[PDB]
Subunit: 343 residues, 4 copies
């Protein structure tokens, strides 16, 4: 081997360790285009901590050639995953017509029983295994071409205990309708690649792109750690430049992303130095404020960059709230995180 890892530099919330996970992907054992061990190589290289090779149960177009059961791609990844310190969550993709559409069952013990005639029996087996289940690409236009709706089956599934999360972001597809669903129904927001091609084929790493993924705030770096995080919705989806999650999580995360220090002060205002200590670009937009409190209208804090920020005091003011939205920290559809720097 020739092993190189590019760590994903993001912080940890107090009490938790931030794990980078991809809970949805494919190999040639379904409709994917790579041998399963490649998914392990890619995760390693990309600084991921955990993955789930979630083959389609119902869709295996290579089956005349690639002859196996539903547990086989997982089996093939185990040694590699161990050697490279990647956590491997057994899972599968229950692929059906809309509704209910496509769901992933992860933390399975056995994939085979998920092959059933009736979709309902498919979900009953996964449930029986106590699987963590989430709705995939609700918004995929192939199944919902005009509008991303919630069907009576999703309601059923959700009441049966067969929906624990929803993908709010899949590959290059962002689905805000799902954000509101997770908020209203108390579900875990998920983000995955749903990779079929080689990873490099779908992400222009050259341009600093990254695979859509999920930040999991775990009490420990183990299978159980991840599961407990997911059970408790202690996640955020990382998509392009967006980070999607509950405010109660994004707020403290943002606080860890920047190092704000008062460099100076006087009668005329305050001088700060704000440093982005992450790999994540941060985009700030001024919000309602005291007009006598003079600062930026817009501001982009690039990764690992320190900025000098002057806040002016007009008329007589001695301080105040430097208010802004972190536009790319999505706490609700079309709503970015609100933050204040009190001076």
């Amino acid at each position: 081997g020739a092993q190189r890892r590019n760590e994903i530099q993001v912080p940890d919330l107090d009490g938790y360790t931030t794990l980078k996970c991809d809970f949805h992907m494919h190999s040639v054992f379904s409709d994917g285009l790579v041998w399963p061990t490649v998914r392990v190589d890619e995760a390693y290289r990309d600084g991921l901590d955990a993955i789930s090779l979630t083959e389609h149960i119902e869709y295996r177009p290579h089956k005349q050639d690639v002859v196996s059961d539903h547990n086989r791609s997982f089996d093939l990844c185990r040694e590699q995953a161990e050697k490279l310190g990647i956590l491997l969550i057994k899972g599968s993709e229950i692929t059906r017509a809309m509704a209910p559409g496509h769901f992933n069952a992860i933390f399975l013990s056995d994939s085979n029983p998920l092959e059933q005639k009736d979709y309902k029996d498919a979900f009953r087996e996964a449930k029986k295994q106590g699987a963590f289940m989430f709705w995939n690409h609700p918004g995929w236009d192939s199944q919902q071409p005009d509008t991303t709706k919630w069907w009576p089956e999703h309601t059923a599934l959700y009441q049966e205990g067969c929906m624990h999360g929803i993908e709010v972001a899949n590959g290059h597809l962002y689905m805000p309708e799902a954000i509101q669903w997770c908020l209203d129904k108390n579900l875990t927001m998920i983000g995955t690649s749903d990779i079929h091609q080689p990873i490099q084929t779908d992400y222009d790493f050259e341009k600093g792109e990254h695979r859509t993924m999920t930040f999991v705030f775990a009490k420990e770096r183990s299978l159980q750690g991840i599961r407990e995080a997911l059970d408790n919705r202690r996640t955020a989806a990382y998509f392009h430049e967006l980070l999607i999650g509950r405010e109660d999580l994004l707020r403290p995360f943002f606080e860890k992303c920047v190092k704000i220090e008062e460099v100076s002060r006087n009668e005329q205002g305050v001088t700060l130095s704000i440093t982005n200590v992450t790999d994540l670009v941060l985009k700030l937009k001024k919000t309602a404020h005291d007009t006598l409190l003079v600062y930026f209208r817009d501001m982009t804090l690039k990764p690992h960059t320190r900025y000098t920020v002057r806040i002016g005091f007009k008329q007589g003011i001695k301080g105040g709230d430097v208010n802004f939205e972190v536009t790319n920290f999505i706490v609700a559809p079309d709503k970015g995180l609100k933050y204040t720097i009190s001076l």
Copy 2:
């Protein structure tokens, strides 16, 4: 020398030649950080056709060291510009407090007379030279920190014949308020770099970024050609992934950006092949349509890439209007170009 040019691959409107211009930049002869010939090297390399080194009249912080008049940086660029086939428009930046703020006077014959005590006399000299004049960075938060307004002086200036355009985009600053101004007041939409640093220092070319600039649709590649285009508002600002301009210009431009061909048809629908023949990424978003006409919800046509697009016919339909907004072809603030592919 060692000369390499990276052409900007965009089309030409019928009757016109598309020229790529930067009408606002700086050298060490004001507050810029490079020798003037560098601006010529950069333009060449970046596939530009024309530039204007527009030094501040009032602000020259290097003056103890760099001793000259206001025509000198232009003078120094002439030979290089000629050798490299770059068109050099003499200009300057009338730098004042808000209001009226900062304006560029281009197509000057002599920069020196623009140095006057009263700003009004500054504009009267530029006018006297029949200069093409535009308002710079109306939105720059340093001078308008809370809101981008139109002052009574801009009204005056505009009625005196001292405003022919407005920058709708400056460097990494997008100012939509200006779009509406140009639309209401019939002005030329401009986009510039306002470069002070070396060009590579402010644009991550690695990530395929490009200097903010202006597409000028000229009847000829000459100084007069450009001037006639500008006089007639035959421009579009190119900013990041956005192209900003009047619909009557963007519509036919988009039509030249894609090559749509019907690959096939039947009772079930139509198969198209759409190719982006430009360096510009194109972003399509489905709009109001016949629901029986099944197609994408969202779609990104990357540069120089061919896509196969299937349009389905539900119930009995034999065709219709494949409607979508080109979200990054801005025809009005917050309003993208509307387009239809009739089948």
Copy 3:
């Protein structure tokens, strides 16, 4: 979503320069991608032809990938066609050294090459009139100290079972093979032998490219490619090196540079030299008239115009501007010699 990155290199007079990769693997042997991926990659890299050459003898996925020796090729035909990629059927005869490993291309059937005796694997290929070349002769796993030519190789060569040698494979450069081809009248080949996804082995961010072969053909067809290979109308493109016989490399260089006299006086000449290609060209001054003053070394970056001055000392009025194109290998440790006569 299809995007092609054309390889901008010139055409010699009377021929079309085809970019080909005659050695590669998929899951159907010991590669790591579905076969259709090799066609996609080829299209994207601006290639014209490929051969998916699965090992006959080494199929470590066969318990899962149950198909025969013809299957990966079969699975690529449609795609190749849709994307304009010529698909040459081949296989890799994979044995112990000697003879080592050989590619057999322009096959009609891969299945019969599965034989107990290596010589029978070769007779089957020969019976199909295959174009056969010796792979990675220098691979350290089989020749760990010296790249040697073995009796088995003489014999295969004498039996009409060696038409080419790989001079470059992946990231491995094997000069010993250059001399062999030169001495034996064989086709120098450059291939990738890709097993990983292509992007995993080549850093395209850095201007790297798959090792490949420039094939100078009379037509963009399977038949056109074969006639070129049969007659050694090839060059191996490896990293920054272009490797081939001098009678090809010389006119090729000529086509890579646009030289113009911009000016002349008593003091010398000013030339403009433009590199109209994607290839970097490295020049180094060789023996010359010392009164003819020019560069010592010079690198011509792709698609870049250079202004070059030649001084005339004492009373000289002209002369031979002599240099070596160091990355244009015409023989082991020998670059193309060239003159600009002024």
Copy 4:
């Protein structure tokens, strides 16, 4: 908006590796950027120290850039300080060959080096106790055929006016200078001699870096740097090459690689070799026990862990895994020799 790209290279025991560029220009001579830009660039490139060394004799912008010889340095002090960049005052004595061009650094005043006789320019620098080195000895504009050592150079050297030679300048590599330093007990230096904006001459997209000097110091201070230069505790970092005396390069390599024995049996040993640096390392097998079977050639990419197997043939139980670190130049055309004893 400040972003620093640290150069990740190791520290030798007892010293701190400083990255320095002792040769560069601005608009105050024949460079093309305002001086403050050189400080910004240095910070961004992960450098620790620079010297803006304007030509004394060649100031083609002086009709516009009217200031004295101390001014560009002066203009950079504040910025340098704000950004933690050590600023060494210097100038370039720019003459015809011989003696050619020399940098004088650790100056107190640049103004007095402006003299009619070159020897007086040097006496002024020497009077200030400057560290003096010969620039681009191999520059083809002044030595177009051969890089020669001239009597003027012997004389400057004997007069205590040559403490170093540039072995690497910008994109120019000059091996002749390596032997000279070795023979004369001088400091090998690598500089950029940047005139353009830095990005214009280096393709960072491709992993290129400014030519520079690794300085092994006892403190991150002007005084620390000087003591290092005085005692030749340097290496020149040029493209993929690191050039320096063997007594520095050997422990430096040792620090670049983390070697571990992962396993051993009768059949051999499996090692893991990690390159913990930003530097690419190129290994080539040298003379060895032929019963000790290992790689022929191997390239260790930055921040990459390699699994390497050493086979034991016949009855061998261990041995010397001998190779050359080809990009670690200890002498002209000589790479660092190294052994891993198993």
